Amino acid sequence: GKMFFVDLSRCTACRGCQIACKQWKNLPAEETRNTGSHQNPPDLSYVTLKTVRFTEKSRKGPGIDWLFFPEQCRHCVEPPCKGQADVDLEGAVVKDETTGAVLFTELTAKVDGESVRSACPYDIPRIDPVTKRLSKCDMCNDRVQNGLLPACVKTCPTGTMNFGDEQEMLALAEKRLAEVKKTYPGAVLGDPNDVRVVYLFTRDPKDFYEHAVA
Amino acid sequence: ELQKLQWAKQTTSICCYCAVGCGLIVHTAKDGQGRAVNVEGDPDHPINEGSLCPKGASIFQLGENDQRGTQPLYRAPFSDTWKPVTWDFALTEIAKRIKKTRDASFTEKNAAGDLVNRTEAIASFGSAAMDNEECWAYGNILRSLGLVYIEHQARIXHSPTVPALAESFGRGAMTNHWNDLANSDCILIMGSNAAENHPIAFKWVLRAKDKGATLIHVDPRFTRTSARCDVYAPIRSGADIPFLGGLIKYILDNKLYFTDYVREYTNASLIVGEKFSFKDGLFSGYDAANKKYDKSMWAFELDANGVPKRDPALKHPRCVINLLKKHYERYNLDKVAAITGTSKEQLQQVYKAYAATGKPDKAGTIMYAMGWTQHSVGVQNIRAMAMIQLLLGNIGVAGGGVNALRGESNVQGSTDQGLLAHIWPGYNPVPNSKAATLELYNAATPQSKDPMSVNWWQNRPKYVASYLKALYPDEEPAAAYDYLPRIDAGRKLTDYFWLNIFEKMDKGEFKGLFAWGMNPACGGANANKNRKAMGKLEWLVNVNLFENETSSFWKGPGMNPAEIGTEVFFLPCCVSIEKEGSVANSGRWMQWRYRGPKPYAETKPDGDIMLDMFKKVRELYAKEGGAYPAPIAKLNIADWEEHNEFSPTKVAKLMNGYFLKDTEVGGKQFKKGQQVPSFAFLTADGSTCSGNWLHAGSFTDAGNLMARRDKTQTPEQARIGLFPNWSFCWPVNRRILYNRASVDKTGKPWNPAKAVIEWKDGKWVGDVVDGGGDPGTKHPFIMQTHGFGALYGPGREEGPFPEHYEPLECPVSKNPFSKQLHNPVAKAVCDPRYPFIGTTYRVTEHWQTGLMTRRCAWLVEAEPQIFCEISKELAKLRGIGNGDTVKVSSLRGALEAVAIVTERIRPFKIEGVDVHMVGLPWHYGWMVPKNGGDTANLLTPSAGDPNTGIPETKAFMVDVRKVW
Ligand SMILES: Nc1nc2c(c(=O)[nH]1)N[C@H]1C(S)=C(S)[C@@H](COP(=O)(O)OP(=O)(O)OC[C@H]3O[C@@H](n4cnc5c(=O)[nH]c(N)nc54)[C@H](O)[C@@H]3O)O[C@H]1N2
Ligand SMILES: Nc1nc2c(c(=O)[nH]1)N[C@H]1C(S)=C(S)[C@@H](COP(=O)(O)OP(=O)(O)OC[C@H]3O[C@@H](n4cnc5c(=O)[nH]c(N)nc54)[C@H](O)[C@@H]3O)O[C@H]1N2
Ligand code: SF4
Ligand code: SF4
Ligand code: SF4
Ligand code: SF4
Ligand SMILES: [S]
Ligand SMILES: [W+6]
């Protein structure tokens, strides 16, 4: 299968990834307002599969620790969302056998959407209020099967986003973690044996987002 | 197959936003016959490798946008509404307004009786957004009509760089390029927010860090750049010269300079005359009455042959290097820490890390952009950076340079094409009223008697003659010289610039304004003044992608259309991906891009709008006569057109230049009609034309070198990322300027692992050598009169060495370095009702005034409204909570914004008092979106200074109050 390695020690919060996800899928923009933050949209929604979360942490002396978290579906190896949806109807949540993408279909309208969101350890699924369909990151699975990178990985200027075969990405994650620890000694990988989106955090993952790790 | 892209034609383009110059791939429906269906990164492009920031990544939404202009709109005097009109009506009536105003206002001779052949009743603003061929054609159209008031964006953010770096190195350009950042051992980012404002540059900055570089950000604020640097050092607004002066002192005291480089390649050894002195904050030759220096008091001592004397031992007390040591001895760590507010610990850390690059096999680079270099000593701020780089041997080397980052996609090119009041294309000056002949114009170029000094500007007569032959091929250059307008020799040059154009408009002194690809109703400082002043125009032509605050100023906030007599023409232009042409990025890479979709609706490329408009004026002169028709009737526009349309290819070929007759030059025979292979083969005798000598080499008999997409590199080229077969850079594909300074007197690189050039088997290999000649036979700075990198720079108005003069007038009363508080060659009220330092800056997601990005729903989604960033300390003082609505006010205006309360802003300690900064984005305007807010330029002053002609947008006084 495939895997993302997301090195958060390289992220400039440019939000190229956030825009590129919507350009590739021609997703609509939400109505947003500034409530005292650069972060927007404030949350994932039926029409927002990725948003960059911004967190400021105080430190001794000048500046802050500014934590950026481009949130997406983790494409779990054994996805609880599928185990929940399968109670109501098989085919609502499926897994691509070659890539490992976890994919929501139109049949998500025929299952308990709220129950599927609740089953997700990362709080990822989002419900359309009108049609009751569920959406989330689909790994750009059509691009991947056609030999292209996902839209957010291709757009990333910094090398934060990385994508490829699971063996090469786990090896990259191990090598990079050892290098990043020279600058950020508390660096850790997020749930690296359980998911296909492996984040490198520079400190306690929960400082980046309440649901950063399981 | 991907269904979305099946049946679509793929073409390449270059991003229409910042000067990084990222590559795009555009997919166009019906095999090129429909609309764009996708826009994303070009995976093969060597700068971005497919990456795009949110601005490039949303170009699909900019282009395929149902809010775009569709056809010309006409607003009659005193009308409440637009009326849709034909191109024929709009361009016919505009040509009549141009001719009526020109005929009534044209001046053959000025008050003194000198030939000037000009009209002062029309002004033009714009634009770095146009393609290079369009910018070149536009300036020549305006000058053929007799205009002198020709300005654009470059006045603000580019103009201080050109004389600072030209004084130091001989050219004004960014010295290196984006890919080259990955070769640096220490990157100092100071007066730049590059992670937000040049985002793909961080690909290369972070690759430097991967190879062991230290990344340093020096900024009054903690930004998205600061988050990814090793060192963040806060600095008080306007304390840059003290910071940089302290680094000069640190380098000299600790002997960290590159001794052999300094001795051989800088003017360290030159003997300054006995008339040079500095005392009490003033150089010698100060005229207190006129607030100006007699710069002759700063001259070098000349030998019997007229060449500046040199002491290669560097022992003479009047050696440049010894005067430099004496000048900077005052910039001790205690005084620099006190004024910068940077801790002595952090200053030592930054100075140690950066000065370590004085080692021959280490390179440091400085990245700066607009920062706060607009004030009256911004030129001296940049001079100090250039001096540090020369002391450390960082000019001409891989991972070195002064990377003066350009702002917009083509601000390099628009400046290169002379869209500023003081320059023709190729940096040949606009003649003044005393330059009565072409021979007198040419007489002004300084000569050198040093046989090792190339002094390349001695070739200027070839470039001016070849330019006049491009415009007027059937005339002798000496005769065509009389067709182009002249500025008054007796007037301050700043009278012709940006700020004074707004001031003259407010005095009712302009009949007509072209706002060509700009939004001055939002981008001009003191927007309340400027919006009122536009009502004093008889006519306004706005060429733009969308209706905007400039096109529609007459129905803006507080405006009664029934009282505003201005006639307005709105002409909708096409987006970048709807046309062909070139843009020159910050590294001087001149990149060709192609049409994907046809122009939307009835929109037109700029080249067609301006050429159609000019042809109609010419037709009116042919039928009616009028003021001095020759410059209009005789202009060569046949070379600009193919198949009844503006031809980017033909204009690019003319800008390169071609032989007008069989010609022997440089011991080679050329045939009539051949393209000029390089500016080395231009002539002063009328045998050659060239629209821009810097373009000679870009489009030769070999073809369009700007359109090369060839990643072929030798090992030495690939080691440093020159990509010499990808596009073309001026001059003659020299990717790293000043590269003769990167080798010793035998042609061996100082840093063989990162060689730029090397002498091997009787030739220079790697980059194109910046100046021909065997190793050890020429001085390395070929555009300098004397050949040397200038530590001592006696052409600068404020003095030959940078010196701290306080740019923050209101909160500062003391200068620790001298008795001279403010710039002695340079009106702030400092009303106590406005106690805070307002500043304006950018965010990653919006572009300039936001005219473009406020129309893109994905960018509004991320940054929907004007905000005000304040410290926890100021929030506590004023009772402001995060996300509260605040009123920000100044002597000039007031606006509402959402408060962002953050530890990323801290108070400045100035003379024992906390002084608070208030940050605003200038990306908002009343037209769009709903509840977005208006321009931060409602708050900014419009004073400027008599030397720069630039307004204060980085430190202006405000109040902030909670709104309930
Ligand atoms: N996203 C985005 N990118 C852009 C643009 C845009 O609108 N949006 N505009 C483009 C254009 S036209 C330009 S000219 C460039 C400009 O690019 P920049 O110069 O990077 O732009 P700013 O954000 O205005 O200013 C940079 C930094 O200068 C700091 N600064 C302010 N005062 C001082 C001072 O006294 N000393 C020092 N050392 N720093 C100071 C500010 O805090 C700020 O972080 O950006 C270009 N790129
Ligand atoms: N307070 C404050 N004021 C500032 C600054 C600041 O930092 N603070 N920055 C200053 C600087 S550095 C700059 S660069 C200026 C920018 O000021 P402006 O140039 O007036 O700003 P915009 O109009 O937003 O710039 C984008 C423009 O490009 C046009 N455009 C895009 N493509 C094309 C095309 O093909 N043809 C034509 N004809 N137009 C096209 C759009 O219609 C739009 O008008 O603002 C300056 N003003
Ligand atoms: S992988 Fe595709 S769907 Fe998922 S966040 Fe990235 S661009 Fe969006
Ligand atoms: S992150 Fe949640 S939604 Fe995504 S695969 Fe895992 S359980 Fe399913
Ligand atoms: S594109 Fe890359 S650097 Fe930019 S916000 Fe997304 S992950 Fe971070
Ligand atoms: S705005 Fe600049 S960094 Fe962003 S995609 Fe365009 S050229 Fe590249
Ligand atoms: S610019
Ligand atoms: W600019």
Numbering used by the authors:
A (entry chain BBB): 2 to 215
B (entry chain AAA): 36 to 861, 869 to 1006
Publication excerpt:
Metal-dependent formate dehydrogenases are important enzymes due to their activity of CO2 reduction to formate.
Crystals of the as-isolated enzyme were soaked with dithionite inside an anaerobic chamber, mimicking the conditions of the EPR titration. The resulting crystals (DvFdhAB_dith, PDBcode7Z5O) diffracted beyond 1.5 Å, and the structure was solved by molecular replacement using the formate-reduced structure (PDBcode6SDV). The overall refined structure is identical to that previously determined from crystals soaked with formate, with RMSDs of 0.21 Å for 963 α-carbons (out of 978) in the catalytic subunit and 0.25 Å for 214 α-carbons (out of 236) in the small subunit. Furthermore, analogous to formate, dithionite reduction leads to a small movement of SeCys and its corresponding loop, with Cα-SeCys192 shifting up about 1 Å and the His193 side chain moving away from the metal and being replaced by a water molecule. Similar to the formate-reduced form, the catalytic metal site was refined with an occupancy of 1 and very reasonable B-factors (W = 14.9 Å2, S12/1101 = 15.0 Å2, S13/1101 = 15.6 Å2, S12/1102 = 15.1 Å2, S13/1102 = 15.1 Å2, Se = 18.9 Å2, and S = 17.5 Å2). Overall, this structure is nearly identical to the formate-reduced one previously reported, which confirms full reduction by formate.
